[PDB]
Design a protein around this ligand. Sequence first.
Ligand code: CL
Ligand code: CL
Lengths: 106, 106
Amino acid sequence: AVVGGLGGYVLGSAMSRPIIHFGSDYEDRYYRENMHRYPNQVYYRPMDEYSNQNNFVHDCVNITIKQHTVTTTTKGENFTETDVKMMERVVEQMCITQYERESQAY
Amino acid sequence: AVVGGLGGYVLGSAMSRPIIHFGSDYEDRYYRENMHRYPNQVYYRPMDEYSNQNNFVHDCVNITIKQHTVTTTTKGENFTETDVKMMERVVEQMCITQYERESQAY
Ligand SMILES: [Cl-]
Ligand SMILES: [Cl-]
């Protein structure tokens, strides 16, 4: 799963994901709980090619996220405690409905 | 991607994911925003095999979630507006760090 025109991009080394503080309590908790689903390294082009930080960082952010997006994974890889708790509730309701579907039609 | 011992399980038809109301504002919003990452149909065994709803629903919930978990997808398939906003912020910080890594060592 390689995004187009990745040639001449280099993958840097892992780093620690920044801890960010958004105002909202939702964003803060969401970020803690989900930050591991995001990249911990970026793609970039050689410095000998840039005139400033801004351009460097434009290509790096764009391509890093595109590339991270095309990457395959299992749905289960992504889920968290929260997802898990939430599927158990909704999948239970749905199985009760399937049950009713089966009793009525049977 | 088939979980073991799926034989004799049947996949029911899609339904509308229930809308659930948890007390917490986090859970409620999280669920709206994420409910589409969860199944909209379940696996189950023939009714002629059960003595009650509870057993039917035990197998159905367990296997449906296991099976949903092993299912492949792209990381980008999973992301939402929120994930996207969040990656743009963290991937920007990281690209700034990679930048500093490159300026110092260069
Ligand atoms: Cl590096
Ligand atoms: Cl059905």
